Every structure is written in structure tokens, then in C-alpha cells.
Design a protein around this nucleic acid. Structure first.
Lengths: 159, 170, 293, 205
RNA sequence: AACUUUAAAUGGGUAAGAAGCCCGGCUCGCUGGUGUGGAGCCGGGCGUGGAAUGCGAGUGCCUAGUGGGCCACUUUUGGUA
RNA sequence: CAGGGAGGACAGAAACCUCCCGUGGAGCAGAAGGGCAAAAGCUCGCUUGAUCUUGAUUUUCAGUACGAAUACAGACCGUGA
RNA sequence: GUCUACGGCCAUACCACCCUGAACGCGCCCGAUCUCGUCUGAUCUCGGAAGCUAAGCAGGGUCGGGCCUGGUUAGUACUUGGAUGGGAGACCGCCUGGGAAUACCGGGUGCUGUAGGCUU
RNA sequence: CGCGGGGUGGAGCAGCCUGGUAGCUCGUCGGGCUCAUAACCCGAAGGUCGUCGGUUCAAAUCCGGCCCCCGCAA
């Protein structure tokens, strides 16, 4: 049976990238975090205090409590057929904003921009995203050159 | 029309005595450096034990001192009188420094005394140029550049015009 | 021979440090304990006082950290002192005090806090601290950025600190690094600190050069003779400068005359000229070889 | 003595090289991977042969040793001892295991380091011989006799490369002519147009 | 396999609105150059219900039996098997 | 720092001094992995935050304990400007 | 155009050699009385301005290395799902989708935030 | 191939765990004693600790892979 250590099997996951060792960049330390910000978790091996557990690596949660040097994040963990909404205290070095949420917050702006605009013009502008539709009928121009013929090459033993 | 701060100066003259033994043998040679340099030298301790010499790890085996300014100018002038103003080709280093070893301290002009004894010592001259203090300052440390360096040939010829000392092979 | 150290594999595995660390200007280990702010403040500006002692100038700035880079909200230079009656001696301990006082009073003028938190007007060099007045806007507080300078007793970086505290800034400090602090018995003398603030330590040296030899006095001090600054009135001169700083600490920018828009620099040579150099190098080497045979 | 090669044939487990973990390994039988007139230049041996494997299987060091002698035994009789150069391109690094018994049975059954074996894939060259162009059917015949020492089937192919180099024989004489290749004894050195111009002058003077 | 500069496919989190945005204002003993910052309270205005497809969902008690498994494609450990 | 080169009476392959290169190839109490260069490594100065007391969370988990740890809060401190 | 102070990203920024730097600036530099610390004012600290771009530093160049970014390798290796496909096996072929990395060959060689100068 | 154990002046030995100084019995050699041998007396040498590597400030000492011998496992 395997051991039950906190950092068992974390040889590559908590390791630093190639030629990215040394001093932690200082823009992480001076990035703000509010309540309810969608946040993804990625462990860092330089700072050993406040490391999240290996089950929270790559996961994404939301912030509920903000302390001096760390934030509390509500995360979802699958424990044998059920999902537990648990709370962890993770230091700031391990924390980035999740860029999955901003696309919805981006899109809402143009939905609201195109709702107040063109309402006085009456033009119904489509707002729902649509999946990639089948392409419409079009004409392909073969002006000049005829479509050249392709031949299956004869086999030759490369090795 | 060479630049006035490309003139070759003397940065430091380093003296060292390695008797290879602590106790009364070492502390008497320190007073030799005291009465010659005019300053208290600093003892030099062993890196690790060698049982052949009778020394141990971190055992006091040497004494050394570094002299700056006009006093290093005077002591170097005193030292080459012992070596009658001559040096070998191999004594000069590739970085522009040189040095030599004299047989004993009585040839400088200091009278022997029975309470201390007789001691040999070692000379080494670290030449320099105005602007060599960049590489060892705390604030804005940096290299000196290839043009500003002192080559071995440039250090050998500086000894030729200044002290008129010939360099013969040996 | 022996193996070459800086081979192809050396630069392939080489990680460079930060640009400011390579230039030796920032002390990022201390900067982490510095201006960055606790996460429960949510962009509350953490102000720090940057004091840099340069060979011919003294720079005193107040900044707070931002994600685009920390922003200077107020700055004061030692070369502004000729306006305030200090022609020369722009890099001593007394000049650092006036530079710090000029930064202190200028910041309070731009925030509307000129009349409140006057600070020390009759400087003695004691342990003064600014206290916030109830029913009034709170006193400005900041911290010192020593940088890479060695903070021993009597450093000029703490001279600008004393000028800032006496100007009405609540900077946490202890009177251990100020000059006049006796090391052996662990006590602080305000009169000795006053002399260094009043520039009287320079006054003793100039008078010392009177008795020893006149030739070294003219070599060590030249603009003191040229601007007629004898040791007698520097205590009056700095008191005149202290009063002149507090009455008008505002700064007026120099007008910007139209630039000729010329390039003193060497422009970067393009690829076509780079490719033309080797074609001319190879062609000339061939014809010069042809003359040998 | 040792087990038959039928058991240790297929690529069963992970690669198990000799290291700190796998210690006490006896030395492999094959030690001389190159023979013939190996101290030869590139311009006299243009023709290169091959023995290309056809199965994803493992070749033991003894089979490589046995086929090396048989290829050399015929080649010496044909063109002498210095008209060729044989290259064994498989180095046995995978250590095989033996569960040596003498009761325990399968209690703690982990293998001892019996010997070494070399993994080979389909389309991989086992042995290559460079020689002169006229002596061509000798290479096929010498490699045909070495096929019987190896398990499975494998094919003999005449390379398009100039000897043991990685450049085509038809293009090889061209790159020497305007100085794109420099013969470095047994091999050749490729010189691009990317280095400093001082070495370009040395090649042209 | 107990090496790695690179590096897939498969896979694992999060988001795709009404509990969302945009305003105006109070409270704080929290933080203070500065109604600074944050949080909580209210009041007001915005519905084209803001990807596809499918399906009524949520929730509380009592609770038997089970806790010897085996086989099959692919991956893989030990063993010659 | 490990290491390498060059020099200097004893002194040599190495005892001690000096210069240059040196992304860590040294060291961190230890086996291994991760991490660390104005440091987490080496040397000094001062000290006992290895002190007292509520809670919350993570880790094995049944999501129970013990142990370990993580962010806090109230004190009393140490250290440093 | 450019510099200084504090920075953000942290080699397109580094490394090796060479060339040019008007003005300010940064520095080299001159000394140890005071503050301070060393064997030594070499370092640090303190007090200055005779000389200077020699160096640091800025810029540019090398069919430069490195680094960054593309093509090629290559629809290759590999891989989701499928077959009463082949083969004694080892393995291979086909359908359905996805899709790499060396060698080799091209291009580039720091942007930028705040404050304060200089070229007036 | 497995575990417990040893190898050291010429024959046998001590000294290790708690490393700072290698001792002793017999034996070899030289001289004396006797006409000569023996016995006895005087004097001196002989110990890389099996090999490699690490450690500690230093290795016979502490540790790991390997050669021989005694008897053991099947």
C-alpha cells in the first residue's frame, strides 16, 4: 500500500518550471482579491507556507474570506459519489484569477450594449450564442488552372 | 596621449607568513609583520587537517597582512632591494599581478632579536587601475571591461620603466 | 587542457535574474517585506519614503506600489536647495535634512494639510513623533526605503528621515541610527544630533583646516570659498533655509522649450544592410585571395 | 546453464537498465561493437548495407555476439581483413531477470540479474557494414549468414546513404565540391552558413 | 519506471444571468493622507429568460440482505509460463 | 558556495596568501523528492514566538477521533531604524 | 531623442569581442576632522569637486553563441472509439476522430508605468 | 544464489562499540656466555589492518557492493 503523506507523488506538480526558479514575481503579492472572485489554484514550490493539498491542484473555486496573507476559497471535491463544498485556506502565492468567468462578464456588456442601442432603431439583433452552423451554398472559382491530379506514391523501403 | 586614469597603479600589497604551526612559533612572526607594516596582522587558520605536517582542522598555521597606500609603495621598494630588482617570467600572473618570496626578514633593514627569532615571508603585488573599485563595491557592482583590464605583458613592462627591474627566464 | 566552463550547455541552462537585480538597484528580498500590502486592505495605499544618496545629489520620493509599477506622488531633490538659499554642500548630512523637510512640507501642501501638523519648527533633534488630531484628517504615515545602503549610526538616509518627521509625517523610527547616539552607554544626545543637522560638524572641519595648513583647505573646499560660505553663518544659513522651505514648499516645473527632434544615437542597422555586409566581405576576400596567387 | 531464449523473447516489462537500483549485473557477452578497418575515411567506402529487423522483440547480447562472429567470418574470407567496417547498432542495456530457486515457491519471487538483452522494433537497423561499391553481393551474403543467429525474420537493405553518414550518396560528392561537408575520419561534419565568418575564410583559404 | 529542455489523444476543475448587471444613499467600534478601502443594509431602473439536446424536481425517517467473487477488450505488476 | 585555471621561500597533487571564471553542479541534522544565491546556504549581534487562551479548516476519513499542518483572533514578547 | 530615481513583465533583456557617446545626469575620482568600520578609509560611512569618459552605463555591430518566434520534420510518431479484419504468435492493416517532439532552414535581439531633468 | 561470523608482523593474538597514544607470547636476525650445541643474557626489525568508495576534524574502529575458509539452508 502507498503512504498517506501530504506531498506524496508531488515531484513534478509542485516543481517550478524550467528556468523559472528564484525570486517569486512581486505582482502576485500586490493583486487584490474580493469576496466571490472565481479563482483557480496552482501550487508553487518556492513558498512552503499555505500550500494547498494535492487534490486542489488545477481546481477552481470562489473566495469567501480574505485574511492578511491568504484567502479562504470554497472548492468542490468529489468524495466517492458525492461532491463536498469545502473551504480551504490558501496563501496568495498559489492563487490566480480564473479567466473562465470574464468571458461571460465580457459578453454581458455587448448584450447590454446592443439591447439599449438599436432599441430606438427596432432592429432585432441576435444575442444567444449559436453552435457552428453548416456552411451555406457557395461557388468555388477554378479560373485558369485545372485542378491537378494527385497520385498515390509507390512504396519504397525507407530503412 | 593616453588617458590619465589608464595609468597603472598599485591596489594592494599582501604579505603572508605560513609557519605551519600554532603557539610560540606563529605569534612571534606576527610581531615581525607588526613592526614592518606598522599595523596588527590577522592570523590565518587551516582549512582541514593534514596529519603529516602536524596540523589540524581550524588550527592556526599562518599569519598575513595587506598594506595599502604609500606604505605599500615603500615596502615594495624595500623588498625588491633584497631580490636586487630582478624577477622571473613565471612570477607574473595572467591577470596582471605578480609576487615573490624572500629568504628572511632581516634583509629589509630590521635588526634581529633573540626573543622572536628568524622568519621568512612572502610578497605579492596586486596591481590596479583607477576604476577597479567597481567590482567590489556593495551598491552597483559590475565588471571592469576588457579594455580596462591589465594583461600579463602590460604588468611586466610596467615593472620595466618604473623600477628598472629586468625579467630573465627561470 | 581543461573543460570550458561557458559552453553551449551553460547558456542553455542559464536562468537570468531580474533586470534591477542584474543592475544591482533593487533588494527584492527586502522589497517583499516592504511596500506590498495585506490582502484585507483592498488597494489601501501603503506609502513608503525612498531616500537615495547620490554622489552629487540627494533624492527623496514618496511612492506606493501599483501593478503597473509604483507611482511617485511627491518628490524632492537636493538641487532645489539653491532656490532656498543653499548654494553648495548639497550632499552632506545637513542637506539631507533640508531635502527631507522639503519633501515633508511639499506633500502636506498638496493634500491641504499645510496648516495642520506643523511639526518641529525649533529643531533640537529630540525624539519627536507626529500625533493625529481628533476631529481632523489623520497624519500622513509612511516607511523608509533604505535600499542597498548600509544603515549604520549617522547615515544620511536617516538625515532625510529626521527632516520628514519634523515636517509632519508619522514615520515609525528609533533614535539608534541618528548621529550623537552613544554606542558604549546606549543613550542619545540631542545636541550632537542638532550639530549634524545644523551642519556644525562641517564647521569644525573648516576651522580645523585653518590651523593646520591653508593649501589643503582650498583643495578640499573650493565652492565654499567661491560662494563665500565661512563656518560662522551656516547655522544661520540653514535656519534661513528651514524658514524658506516651510513658507513656500510648492514646486514649479521648468518650461519645456521645443526640441529639435534630432537623434544623437546610432540607429539600428537593418537586415538588408546586415546581409549586404557579408556579401561584400565574402566577395572582397575572394579577390584579395586572387591577388596572392 | 542459462535459460532458452524462448522465455526472454517478447517485450514484456518496462526497460530495466543497469543502474543504482539494478546492481550486481554480470557483463554482457558482446563488448566489441565495431570491427574491421574502422580506422578508415569516408570517401573509399560509399556502399552501406543493413540488417533491418521486422518484429517488436528483444535481441540478447549472446545473439548479437554470435551473429557478429558469423558476419565477420565470411567477410574476412571474401575481401580480406581491411576492406570493410562492421557496425553493431544495438547495445544491450535491458537487464533480464531470473527467479533462481534452490520451500517458498512464489513467496518474494523477484528475479536476480541474469543477463542483458537489447530491445529492437520494426524498421530498426541491427547491423550495418560499409565497404567498397563493387563488393556488393558479399555484404548481402555476409548478412544472410548472420540471420540464422537471430530469432524471427529480418531483411537486408542497401542504404541510399554514403557509408555510415546521414547524407545521400548521390548528393555526397556535391557537398564536398562547394565545401558543405568536411570528412572527419570515420564520419563527416556538416558546416552550415550560420557560424561566424572567420571560419568561412579558413575553409576558403 | 525511480532522467528530461519539449510534449500530445483520452481526461479533471469553473463559467454560459433575474441569487445578473447599473445606479443613489445610510451604518461600521474594521483600515486610514482624503465619504480612503472593504463589508452589511436599504431604495430604484433594466426580461430578446442571454449555447445545443434531453428530462418533473427537491427533501425527511425506518431499513433487510451484502462485506469469500469471477470472466472479457485495452494498460500494467511479479513470475519462464 | 562546489569546482577549475593562473601565480607566490619552505609548499610538492594538496599546509597559507592573491587574481579570474564559476545558475549552484556546494550546503541546508539525517535516506529520497521538491525548494533556496545581496538566501532557506556561511559568519556575527540580540533573544527565547519551542510562552498563554478561544474558535475555524486541511490531511487518513465514516468525512469520527489521535498525530501533523494551514489561515485567523486576543494577550504578552523577541528582533530590526 | 535621451538620462536619473523607484518599478512591472523577468535573456527579444544574457554572454564574448569591437566602435561611438553633444548637454544634463549617473559615475570614475580627491581626503579621514566629525558619524561609522575595518589588518588596511580596499569595502562601508563621512567631508567634497582638481581631472575624466579610461571604466561603470547608454546605443550600435558580429554570415556570433544563447534566447524568443515560425516553416520543415508530418498528417509522421502517438492516441479516443469499432469490426465474426489479417497473422500461430510477435505484431500489422482499415474505419471514425484528435494530433506531437529532434536534426535542418528562416525572422527578431527589450517594451512599458510614475516623478524629475537634458538636448535649453 | 540466501542469512550469522572471520581474514591483521612468519605462527597464533590484543586494541573498535566510547575513533586523538598501535602492545604482547612464540618466532627471524646480530652479539655475548661454551672447546661446540642447547639453555640463558643483551639489542634491533617486522603490523597498508582483504579491495574499492564515502563519512567524521581523522578510519583497524562507522557504513555499502565485492575474493577465500570453516559448518549450516534444498
Amino acid at each position: 500500500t502507498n503512504t498517506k503523506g501530504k506531498r506524496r507523488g508531488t515531484r513534478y506538480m509542485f516543481s517550478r518550471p524550467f528556468r523559472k526558479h528564484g525570486v517569486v514575481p512581486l505582482a502576485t503579492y500586490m493583486r487584490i482579491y474580493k469576496k466571490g472572485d472565481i479563482v483557480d489554484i496552482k501550487g508553487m514550490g518556492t513558498v512552503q507556507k499555505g500550500m494547498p493539498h494535492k487534490c486542489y491542484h488545477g481546481k477552481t473555486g470562489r473566495v469567501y474570506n480574505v485574511t492578511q496573507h491568504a484567502v479562504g476559497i470554497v472548492v468542490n471535491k468529489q468524495v466517492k459519489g458525492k461532491i463536498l463544498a469545502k473551504r480551504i485556506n490558501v496563501r496568495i502565492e498559489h492563487i490566480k484569477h480564473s479567466k473562465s468567468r470574464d468571458s461571460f462578464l465580457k459578453r454581458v456588456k455587448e448584450n447590454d450594449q446592443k439591447k439599449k442601442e438599436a432599441k430606438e432603431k427596432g432592429t432585432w439583433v441576435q444575442l444567444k450564442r449559436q453552435p457552428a452552423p453548416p456552411r451555406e451554398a457557395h461557388f468555388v472559382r477554378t479560373n485558369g488552372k485545372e485542378p491537378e491530379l494527385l497520385e498515390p506514391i509507390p512504396y519504397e523501403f525507407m530503412a | 596621449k593616453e588617458n590619465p586614469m589608464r595609468e597603472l597603479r598599485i591596489r594592494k600589497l599582501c604579505l603572508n607568513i605560513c609557519v605551519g604551526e600554532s603557539g610560540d612559533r606563529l605569534t612571534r612572526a606576527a610581531k615581525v609583520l607588526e613592526q614592518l607594516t606598522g599595523q596588527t596582522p590577522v592570523f590565518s587558520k587551516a582549512r582541514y587537517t593534514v596529519r603529516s605536517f602536524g596540523i589540524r582542522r581550524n588550527e592556526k598555521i599562518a599569519v598575513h597582512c595587506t598594506v595599502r597606500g604609500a606604505k605599500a609603495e615603500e615596502i615594495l621598494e624595500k623588498g625588491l632591494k633584497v631580490r636586487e630588482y630582478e624577477l622571473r617570467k613565471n612570477n607574473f600572473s595572467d591577470t596582471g599581478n605578480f609576487g615573490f618570496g624572500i629568504q628572511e626578514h632581516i634583509d629589509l633593514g630590521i635588526k634581529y632579536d633573540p626573543s622572536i627569532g628568524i622568519y621568512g615571508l612572502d610578497f605579492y603585488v596586486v596591481l590596479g587601475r583607477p576604476g577597479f573599485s567597481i567590482a567590489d563595491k556593495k551598491r552597483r557592482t559590475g565588471c571592469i571591461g576588457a579594455k580596462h583590464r591589465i594583461s600579463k605583458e602590460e604588468a611586466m613592462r610596467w615593472f620595466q620603466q618604473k623600477y628598472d627591474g629586468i625579467i630573465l627566464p627561470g | 587542457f581543461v573543460k570550458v566552463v561557458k559552453n553551449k550547455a551553460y547558456f542553455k541552462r542559464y536562468q537570468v535574474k531580474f533586470r534591477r537585480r542584474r543592475e544591482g538597484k533593487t533588494d527584492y528580498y527586502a522589497r517583499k517585506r516592504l511596500v506590498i500590502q495585506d490582502k484585507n486592505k483592498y488597494n489601501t495605499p501603503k506609502y513608503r519614503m525612498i531616500v537615495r544618496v547620490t554622489n552629487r545629489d540627494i533624492i527623496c520620493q514618496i511612492a506606493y506600489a501599483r501593478i503597473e509599477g509604483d507611482m511617485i506622488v511627491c518628490a524632492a531633490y537636493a538641487h532645489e536647495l539653491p532656490k532656498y538659499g543653499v548654494k553648495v554642500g548639497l550632499t552632506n548630512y545637513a542637506a539631507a535634512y533640508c531635502t527631507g523637510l522639503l519633501l515633508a512640507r511639499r506633500l502636506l501642501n498638496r493634500f491641504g494639510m499645510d496648516k495642520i501638523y506643523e511639526g518641529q519648527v525649533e529643531v533640537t533633534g529630540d525624539e519627536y513623533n507626529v500625533e493625529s488630531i481628533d476631529g481632523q484628517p489623520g497624519a500622513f504615515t509612511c516607511y523608509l526605503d533604505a535600499g542597498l545602503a548600509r544603515t549604520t549610526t549617522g547615515n544620511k538616509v536617516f538625515g532625510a528621515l529626521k527632516g520628514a518627521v519634523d515636517g509632519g509625517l508619522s514615520i515609525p523610527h528609533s533614535t539608534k541610527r541618528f548621529p550623537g547616539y552613544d554606542s558604549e552607554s546606549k543613550e542619545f544626545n540631542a545636541e550632537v544630533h542638532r550639530k549634524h543637522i545644523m551642519g556644525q560638524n562641517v564647521a569644525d572641519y573648516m576651522r580645523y583646516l585653518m590651523e593646520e595648513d591653508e593649501d589643503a583647505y582650498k583643495k578640499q573646499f573650493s565652492q565654499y570659498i567661491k560662494n563665500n560660505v565661512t563656518p560662522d553663518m551656516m547655522e544661520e544659513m540653514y535656519k534661513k533655509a528651514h524658514a524658506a522651505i516651510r513658507e513656500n514648499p510648492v514646486y514649479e516645473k521648468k518650461p519645456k522649450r521645443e526640441v529639435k527632434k534630432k537623434r544623437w544615437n546610432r540607429p539600428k542597422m537593418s537586415l538588408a544592410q546586415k546581409k549586404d555586409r557579408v556579401a561584400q566581405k565574402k566577395a572582397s576576400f575572394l579577390r584579395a585571395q586572387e591577388r596572392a596567387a | 546453464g542459462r535459460r532458452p531464449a524462448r522465455c526472454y523473447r517478447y517485450c514484456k516489462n518496462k526497460p530495466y537498465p543497469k543502474s543504482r537500483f539494478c546492481r550486481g549485473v554480470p557483463d554482457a557477452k558482446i563488448r566489441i561493437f565495431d570491427l574491421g578497418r574502422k580506422k578508415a575515411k569516408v570517401d573509399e567506402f560509399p556502399l552501406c548495407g543493413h540488417m533491418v529487423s521486422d518484429e517488436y522483440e528483444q535481441l540478447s547480447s549472446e545473439a548479437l555476439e554470435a551473429a557478429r562472429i558469423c558476419a565477420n567470418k565470411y567477410m574476412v574470407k571474401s575481401c580480406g581483413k581491411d576492406g570493410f567496417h562492421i557496425r553493431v547498432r544495438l547495445h544491450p542495456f535491458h537487464v533480464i531477470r531470473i527467479n533462481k530457486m534452490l520451500q517458498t515457491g512464489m513467496r518474494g519471487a523477484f528475479g536476480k540479474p541474469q543477463g542483458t538483452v537489447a530491445r529492437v522494433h520494426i524498421g530498426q537497423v541491427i547491423m550495418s557494414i560499409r565497404t567498397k561499391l563493387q563488393n556488393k553481393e558479399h555484404v548481402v551474403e555476409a548478412l544472410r549468414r548472420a540471420k540464422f543467429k537471430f530469432p524471427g525474420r529480418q531483411k537486408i537493405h542497401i542504404s541510399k546513404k554514403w557509408g555510415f553518414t546521414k547524407f545521400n550518396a548521390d548528393e555526397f560528392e556535391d557537398m564536398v565540391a562547394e565545401k558543405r561537408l568536411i570528412p572527419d575520419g570515420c564520419g563527416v561534419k556538416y558546416i552550415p552558413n550560420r557560424g561566424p565568418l572567420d571560419k568561412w575564410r579558413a575553409l576558403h583559404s
